[PDB]
Symmetry: C3
Subunit: 133 residues, 3 copies
């Protein structure tokens, strides 16, 4: 047994911009490393990890994969499609993490001006240890 | 370790609500996959990673499914115009028992051709 | 420690057709298997590997995962969208590699453009 998780977000609530995506269904979490209420994976086992997400919203969808590791990770994945269209954006990375480092996803508004309302977001976020540091 | 990668690249249409079948096997270390049925069947109980990347012209809805307990049903849809063909990706980390099947199947959220790569491997043994 | 890498292309220059995408930032490379200047992963440890990329470019984007294995891999992933739209295409595979085998991604015309790309890979088991 090693860290391995799969968490799902499927709900009516809008997902706030620039805050960690939270999830309402835990499919797997072997080492109990993920808190679906905060949206954070928190590393207990130091090592190299794989993370990947698959997510959709109506209209433009931008998500960042982020970490509190040093140096920090901030990777953006954006579908700049039309308002009426809903697509699945996927992104992810192989990351080296220390004990206590956090990893999450976060929506942002990749374009447009002030005053945009957050939107519903379907999301599957997956991750697992590749090897122990 | 169980580990596979299978490819659908063909002229036939992919029927709705049936497992996607494949014509090319790139990898199948433990011979867990039958491309003619579209099923991965677990031999080694444990925690697995699964991912697909697929494209069709126009709207494409795919479900990752299992006969594990309780059964998985995860949808991934591109709702785009009929002129546009795009890649939809989806997948999960699943806990499997021996004999559990895992597959992908299209659904309408007139079938079409479907390009698909479906990948999977054991993360750890139970 | 296992072969495991994550490389990032986030720059200005266009990614030419039919040659390996090169990268300007190495996020992870545990076994020093990736050379970002060439765009190649080169296998040192024989075994079964997982490879995956996520990339975006303005308008149409076609990317191909390739290897010099026997037999060689050529797996295409295409987003056939309009000119004013940037989307993320993803693709990948599980591949069996011998020492010296090379793996990479390359753009093709399904007018080159800049390309944001993250390319990841890791050993699943040793052969």
């Amino acid at each position: 047994e090693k860290p391995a998780f799969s968490v799902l977000r499927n709900e009516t609530s809008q997902a706030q911009y620039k805050q960690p995506v939270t999830f309402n269904d835990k499919l797997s979490d072997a080492n109990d490393d993920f808190q679906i209420k905060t949206g954070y994976f928190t590393c207990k086992v130091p090592g190299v990890y794989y993370f990947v997400f698959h997510a959709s919203s109506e209209g433009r969808l931008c998500l960042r994969l982020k970490s509190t590791s040093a140096p920090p990770v901030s990777l953006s994945f954006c579908d700049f499609n039309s308002k009426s269209v809903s697509l699945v954006v996927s992104g992810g990375a192989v990351l080296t993490l220390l004990k206590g480092d956090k990893v999450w996803i976060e929506p942002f508004a990749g374009d447009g001006g002030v005053g945009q309302m957050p939107k519903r977001l379907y999301a599957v976020f997956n991750g697992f240890l590749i090897y122990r540091n």
